[PDB]
Assembly symmetry: C2
Homo-oligomer: 186 residues x 2
């Protein structure tokens, strides 16, 4: 009905990023696990885990968001700029999920960048954007994003959305646990 | 009413790019004209000219779109990553507008990137996006973009939108002339 900025954000994210990165994602993780060391087999997960914090807060470093999340390595490149699409290549990060001072899991992990736009709008007066407005568009962003992936060809299979909202007060939340739950699940 | 992907695209473009680049645009052009050579005064225009082709076609190189548009130089950097915003710095291009094999004008010039998303959607089956759909969203993108700039603080003053549509057949159009008209105008 109204403006609904989320719809545009979701499509740009998929068309301009997800669809270009996802196809070769499995291969780049295979390279890290099997072809970057002859003494050990890597155990990096097979999917791109996309953090979708409804509050749209996106820290520069994951560890600060949670100490139990630690940067491990850069996802190896392919490498091919001219495969057709061009934007390639892209920088991606592998993280180890700590639990009891012990590595519980490992995976390529990142926030949904468009949420920065959402966050920035709410902090921009001319936008007339409130907290609830941000939440509304954030939820919407996820809904339309997963709607897109469903119609996608296996792109949904190389990818998983981790949407979550933290309580406002007396808030006990563990990002790593949230991710782990997802990793562990399969 | 409906999805209207343009609204999101316009806001992301302004919030994530225009608003970060525009503020220091005047200074970077002042640097090129006055502080990059002690033998001559540069004559680069004072505004960022944004190409808004309604057909959403965005060539890698401007000259191919028109031979009379020639890359001249990179817009000098500031340079400051941590001014608050971070994405900075950004690469920008200065172009000379030829006319009769003679330089008629010179300015920092670039396409509105989000139009690539529009173009890409129309070429994506699952989107259910037609030519007219692309045009509709393209026009909409410009409308909401200029709506944003109007409420902006002088950002509109350091910037100018060049929206244009080319005829389908027997099409005689000169991009350089279009830009020049704009430059000349002031």
């Amino acid at each position: 009905g109204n403006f609904n900025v989320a719809h545009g954000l979701a499509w740009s994210y998929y068309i301009g990023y997800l669809r270009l990165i996802l196809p070769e994602l499995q291969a780049r993780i295979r390279t890290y696990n099997q072809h970057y060391n002859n003494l050990l087999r890597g155990a990096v997960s097979q999917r791109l885990y996309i953090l979708l914090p409804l509050d749209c807060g996106v820290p520069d470093n994951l560890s600060m968001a949670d100490p139990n999340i630690r940067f491990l390595d850069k996802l190896p490149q392919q490498t091919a700029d001219r495969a057709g699409i061009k934007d390639r290549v892209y920088s991606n990060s592998i993280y180890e999920l700590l639990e009891n001072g012990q590595r519980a899991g490992t995976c390529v992990l990142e926030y949904a960048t468009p949420l920065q736009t959402l966050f920035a709008m709410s902090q921009y007066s001319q936008a007339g954007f409130s907290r609830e407005d941000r939440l509304e568009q954030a939820k919407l962003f996820c809904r339309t994003l997963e709607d897109i992936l469903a119609d996608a060809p296996e792109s949904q299979n190389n990818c998983r959305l981790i949407a979550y909202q933290e309580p406002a007060d007396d808030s006990s939340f563990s990002l790593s646990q949230e991710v782990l739950r997802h990793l562990r699940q399969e």
